[PDB]
Design a protein around this nucleic acid. Structure first.
Lengths: 70, 61, 103, 199, 142, 69, 138, 11
RNA sequence: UAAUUGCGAUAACGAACGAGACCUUAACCUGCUAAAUAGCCCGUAUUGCCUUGGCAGUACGCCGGCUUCUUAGAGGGACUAUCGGCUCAAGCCGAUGGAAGUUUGAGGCAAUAACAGGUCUGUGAUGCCCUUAGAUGUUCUGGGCCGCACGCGCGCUACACUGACAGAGCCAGCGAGUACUCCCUUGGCCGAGAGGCCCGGGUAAUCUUGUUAAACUCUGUCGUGCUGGGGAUAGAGCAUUGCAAUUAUUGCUCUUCAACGAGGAAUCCCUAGUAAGCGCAAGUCAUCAGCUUGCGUUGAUUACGUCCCUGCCCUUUGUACACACC
């Protein structure tokens, strides 16, 4: 269960463009992504939502290299 | 024969030519100071209990 | 003007094209104040043919399974005889339709 | 009313088998508990469990279930579990009349006694055997004990006027004590004897 | 309380109807007994001497529970596997004559009648109530 | 190896004075020491049942077992 | 009006639909009572939901069940599943759940499979079930 | 009894 | 990490195939849209028994109500979510919840470079050579491809009592069906049996069809004897398919009653509804399945590993090999 580059690359750009619009809740983050992105599969959308909500959990305690938002 | 009872506290890798044999460190559960190394043939978990016929052979490594 | 309790049967290989045909036909009749009965769902009839891949018999033995599926979605209505002629117009390719007065 | 009068006899008392209760369990040794499961009673052995998914999930299973499955082997008896249950039930009746003790009293001590405590392992020696006489884990000991008991009954009843109901039954009473004239005991002591030589 | 056919065990019920029919002692027999195989799949005639009467009791029992039945359906109901030798076994049906005359002769006993409206044979007004009466002979026999 | 299909007075007397001490009586037991056939064993099995010397434990088309009274 | 609820239980290919109506304590399956419909040795696997719960809790309930499809042992597992689901569902809708929560906890503590089904079907393959044909010389 | 050819060396 | 799948280090930066993604299918929906070629409740008529107020069946309803079960559409659902323990990270182990937590299970498609692999006897795909009117073209009659001192492979039935035989009890699923000539077949009668005659339904969720299959369960006979286990071989008679049945097409009745007591050196397949046991449907078909392709019933022992044997991928290293350790 390792995520490939397409999921990870897409997750990086979403966080920096819309940082405040999505929060620690996985259910809410699922509905933010599909509104502001074009995904042709529900399963692909689910994986994208899973990674981005994990990233902000570790953002909450100290910044991480490779992430920059306004 | 003065048979002794021992208990497993930690498992240290799997030995043998074909992986059948496993190596464990046992505790005599009557004198907590002493501890030795033994060899076992079957599947072993922590807190398992083994019966030892002789307590002077030990094992390599 | 005598009602005859018509029944219409449909057949096609596609599934999306057939469904929207029935969706508009029920609306074409509902607005006309006609008592309409639901679009029943007849069983899909799947037929398959299996044959061996190689044409000569050498090497390993491997087979493949072709498939084909058909759906019906037949519909019936209570209406006079002349009105139904103008209600079944403008049909597209693929779907076959058969009309039965069922008098 | 809705139930037969037979089952009304046991409903007042504690739940148990058709005749016998799983109370008053032996106090004889250690290291064999936690792998023979009697805390949860079962009416009939038959059950569609999930015991073949993990490593030790089958360790938490009634012993009668373990015994019943091993009784059906050798090609002809595949999937005929209903026939096996009939044989098992009758065998518990035979041992009860020949010994006032509980049938589970016979079954438990029989299994715990016919399990080898040492065995020789195969380490390559370029055509020879450097049998190191390793120890045996408790889980394998109970697994092999069930196989030894059942294979003895299948051997005896083959082409014999006797029936499997008591051929299996007579082994259990023999294996309850040090009878030494049973099939299981003959193989168990033989395996331990050769292991001692290769120490 | 009241009892019916479904309220009694099938094995003892058919045996009871064979015992009850001893006292009336009126069932036609066409002389086929003691010679017939009762089926092509078989090799020896049935052991019990009064097999013609036990079979009729069971046959009339299921027709009480089934709505329409003919000779063809009963031919394969009583069929079984056949040992063809060294070839794999198959399924073959029972004899036609055994089941046809055992219920044609049973027609005149006023137990069940024809069903020409759709086919087969159905149970009669007074025929069904007779098999109900013997249920209490078994139910309270306990 | 071969057993006896008929039961004589030399074998009849063994039954009514010896079966009073068995803990279990089965089809195998009769074939064991009286050296008689199984078919004869079944005939003697039911006839002595009603005489009130043995009682049934479990009944089946396959096996019969009896004990003391 | 009349109190009734419908539940169903499934197995490999055995469907057991049941309707529980407020009655007097009568249970019959496929018309016949529980005395008949089972193999003689398999009759034991039908009564467990009764003894663990008690006969006093079936005072005024009537259940009739029709089951078809599958095999002999598959059907008896389906009907025993409908009984467990029927008895707990009727009380939940119409009476206080102090029983229901006590019914649910006790029923699954003895056996979880009484309330949930086991998903198992077969897999098609081009060699048999899962094994291939014999090889000539490896 | 005795086979030649293929890859074999010494003893 | 199942993976050139990633975290990262960096004389490299940015990209293209393969993997993944994806598609079909098996598991979940008391929520939506619904249904007399699918069901239930209800209402009439009606039957038996207790009689109660009941229980179990029949026939009808076509706007009486409804869609849990059946059916096929639109969507929802799992993402490793939450918790505890390691780690900077990617990740791994256990638990709880849950229909489902190995990529959830099983499949389809599937890169570069290659083989003197198979096929001219599938093709009106094809070069060249050969024969073309005493024809290697076509057509009709008959035979052979099945012929048997012997070696080898894929299967079928058994060596029995955990069995055979006899009565009774009685449970599936995937599919197929009428022409310019009859294709699956209900019912009635005759018939030891296989079969025969006469009405009738279905171009098919409507009829065959609930395909009430087999194993299995209950009650009996035989009694360890290669015997009522086993059915090879061979005699006589009665039938169907076809223009034609002998070197028997197949089927039915009586009689004949061989070898075979778990199998040497060697050797194949397989991890959960899986092995094995048992049967059913389809293909080829006027008739013949011990074969294959699919379908369902019953349902286990043991491991949760390693490189010891037979092989595969990457790095360092050696070479007198390059047709490459034959």
């Amino acid at each position: 269960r390792v995520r490939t580059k397409t999921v990870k690359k897409s997750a990086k750009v979403i966080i920096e463009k819309y940082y405040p619009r999505l929060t620690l809740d996985f259910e809410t983050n699922k509905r933010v992504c599909d509104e502001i992105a074009v995904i042709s599969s529900k399963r692909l959308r689910n994986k994208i939502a899973g990674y981005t909500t994990h990233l902000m959990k570790r953002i909450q305690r100290g910044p991480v290299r490779g992430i920059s938002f306004k | 024969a003065p048979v002794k009872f021992v208990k497993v506290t930690r498992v240290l890798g799997r030995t043998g030519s074909r992986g059948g044999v496993t190596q464990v460190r046992v505790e005599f559960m009557d004198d907590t100071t002493r501890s030795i190394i033994r060899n076992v043939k079957g599947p072993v978990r922590e807190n398992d209990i083994l019966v030892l016929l002789e307590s002077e052979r030990e094992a390599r490594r | 003007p005598k009602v005859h309790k018509i029944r219409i049967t449909l057949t096609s290989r596609k599934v999306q094209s057939l469904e929207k045909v029935c969706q508009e036909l029920i609306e074409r009749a509902k607005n006309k104040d006609l008592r309409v009965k639901g679009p029943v769902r007849m069983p899909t009839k799947t037929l398959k043919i299996t044959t061996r891949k190689t044409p000569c018999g050498e090497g390993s033995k491997t087979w493949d399974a072709y498939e084909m599926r058909i759906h019906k979605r037949l519909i019936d209505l209570t209406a006079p005889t002349e009105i139904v002629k103008q209600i079944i117009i403008n049909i597209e390719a693929g779907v076959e339709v058969e009309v039965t007065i069922a008098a | 009313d809705v139930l037969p009068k037979e089952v009304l006899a046991e409903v007042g008392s504690v739940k148990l088998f058709n005749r016998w209760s799983y109370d008053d369990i032996e106090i004889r040794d250690i290291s064999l508990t936690d792998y023979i499961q009697i805390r949860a009673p079962v009416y009939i052995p038959h059950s569609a469990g999930r015991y073949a998914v993990k490593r030790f999930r089958k360790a938490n299973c009634p012993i009668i279930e373990r015994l019943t499955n091993s009784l059906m082997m050798h090609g002809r008896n595949n999937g005929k579990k209903l026939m096996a249950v009939r044989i098992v039930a009758h065998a518990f009746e035979i041992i009860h009349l020949m010994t006032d003790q509980n049938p589970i009293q016979v079954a438990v001590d029989a299994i715990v006694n016919c399990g080898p405590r040492e065995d020789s392992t195969r380490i390559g020696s370029a055509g020879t055997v450097r049998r190191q006489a390793v120890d045996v884990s408790p889980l394998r000991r109970v697994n092999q004990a069930i196989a030894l008991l059942t294979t003895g009954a299948r051997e005896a009843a083959f082409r014999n006027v006797k029936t499997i109901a008591e051929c299996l039954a007579e082994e259990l009473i023999n294996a309850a004590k040090g009878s030494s004239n049973s099939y299981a005991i003959k193989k168990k002591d033989e395996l331990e004897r050769v292991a001692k030589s290769n120490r | 309380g009241g009892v019916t056919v479904r309220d009694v065990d099938a094995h003892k019920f058919v045996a009871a109807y064979a015992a009850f029919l001893k006292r009336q002692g009126k069932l036609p027999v066409p002389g086929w007994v003691d010679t017939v195989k009762t089926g092509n799949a078989k090799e020896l005639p049935p052991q019990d001497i009064d097999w013609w009467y036990i079979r009729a009791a069971s046959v009339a029992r299921h027709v009480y529970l089934r709505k329409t039945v003919g000779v063809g359906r009963l031919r394969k109901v009583h069929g079984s596997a056949k040992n063809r030798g060294t070839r794999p076994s198959h399924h073959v049906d029972a004899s036609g004559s055994v089941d046809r005359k055992i219920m044609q002769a049973l027609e005149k006993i006023q137990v069940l009648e024809k069903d020409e409206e759709r086919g087969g044979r159905r149970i009669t007004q007074q025929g069904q109530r007779d098999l109900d009466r013997i249920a209490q002979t078994v139910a309270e026999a306990d | 190896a071969q057993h006896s299909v008929i039961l004589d007075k030399a074998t009849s007397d063994k039954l009514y004075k010896d079966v009073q001490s068995y803990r279990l009586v089965t089809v195998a037991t009769l074939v064991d020491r009286l050296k008689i056939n199984g078919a004869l064993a079944r005939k003697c099995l039911k006839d002595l049942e009603e005489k009130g010397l043995i009682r049934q434990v479990v009944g089946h088309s396959k096996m019969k077992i009896y004990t003391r009274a | 009006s009349v109190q009734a609820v419908q539940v169903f239980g499934k197995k490999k290919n055995a469907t057991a639909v049941a309707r529980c109506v407020q009655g007097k304590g009568l249970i019959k399956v496929n018309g016949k009572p529980l005395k008949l419909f089972a193999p003689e040795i398999l009759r034991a696997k039908l009564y467990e939901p009764i003894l663990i719960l008690g006969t006093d809790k079936f005072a005024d309930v009537d259940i009739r069940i029709r089951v078809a499809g599958g095999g002999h042992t598959s059907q008896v597992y389906a009907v025993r599943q409908a009984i467990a689901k029927s008895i707990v569902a009727y009380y939940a809708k119409y009476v206080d759940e102090h029983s229901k929560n006590l019914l649910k906890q006790e029923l699954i503590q003895f056996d979880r499979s009484l309330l949930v089904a086991d998903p198992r079907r077969c897999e098609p393959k081009k060699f048999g079930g899962r094994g291939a044909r014999a090889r000539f010389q490896k | 009894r005795r086979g030649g050819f293929r890859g074999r060396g010494k003893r």
